[PDB]
């Protein structure tokens, strides 16, 4: 996250950290995700696309730091990994960038509720907040597009939703953005999501609930003027989610 503040998981108790193990000893961070229900985490397909070997990923819930433990964290293995059929990547966007990870503990259980682990709510069929709404994104991605490491402490920032009309202007992303995507940016292009933030949530309040309105998917650069962050529009994937959960 460029800008933003550092936080603890208490503040985003549904954020999931996904890592990959290597035959060598190291585990590296891949992407973020969100807990939907006790056994399911939702993220983005582009995060798994190149190495869809579920057995090598580890999911941690209740984690405030990246490579050091937090008291209360839970570790899970990926029992099922569901990527989207119709996922496509072009010279910028990712289409149908949503994925589901069913988690299993080494003891055979799914997540347990704590002060650091909670589920986020899903929206109702094609129901989104209006452009202008301030939503928050959270993650462990880069703080500067030029960095080559990720922060050790979790970060969060608030961004506002912008309309499709604004985002599809030729000097923004043109028709690279579709109705199944959403764009969010800071009015003064100061904060934004970036590499390493993929998969994590864009949360907004809808009808009184903190709802997962988007999943970090792509953007041109990070915090670039007229280059909003694009997210997968969850409200449009509800049928797909349902058929699997």
């Amino acid at each position: 996250i460029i800008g933003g503040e550092f936080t603890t998981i208490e503040n985003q108790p549904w954020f999931a950290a996904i890592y990959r193990r290597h035959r060598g000893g190291s585990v590296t961070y891949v992407c973020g995700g969100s807990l939907m229900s006790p056994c399911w985490v939702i993220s983005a397909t582009h995060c798994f696309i190149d190495y869809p070997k579920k057995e090598d990923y580890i999911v941690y819930l209740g984690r405030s730091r990246l490579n050091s433990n937090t008291q209360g964290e839970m570790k899970f293995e990926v029992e099922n990994l569901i990527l989207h059929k119709d996922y496509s990547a072009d010279t910028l966007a990712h289409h149908n960038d949503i994925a589901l990870l069913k988690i299993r503990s080494k003891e055979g259980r799914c997540a347990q509720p704590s002060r650091t682990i909670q589920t986020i709510c899903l929206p109702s069929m094609y129901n989104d907040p209006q452009f202008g709404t301030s939503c928050e994104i959270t993650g462990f991605g880069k703080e500067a597009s030029t960095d080559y490491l990720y922060p050790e402490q979790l970060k969060m920032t608030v961004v506002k939703l912008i309309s499709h009309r604004e985002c599809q202007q030729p000097h923004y992303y043109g028709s690279e953005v579709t109705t199944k995507m959403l764009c969010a940016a800071d009015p003064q292009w100061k904060t934004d999501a970036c590499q390493g933030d993929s998969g994590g949530p864009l949360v907004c309040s809808l009808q009184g609930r903190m709802t997962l309105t988007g999943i970090v998917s792509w953007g041109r650069g990070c915090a670039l003027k007229d280059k909003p962050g694009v997210y997968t529009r969850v409200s449009h994937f509800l049928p797909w989610i349902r058929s699997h959960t």
Binding site: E10, N11, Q12, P13, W14, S37, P38, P113, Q118, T119, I120, C121, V203, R209, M210, T211
Partner: peptide, 8 residues
Amino acid sequence: LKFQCGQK
């Protein structure tokens, strides 16, 4: 106690 989605 039990999950209550969106509750911090």
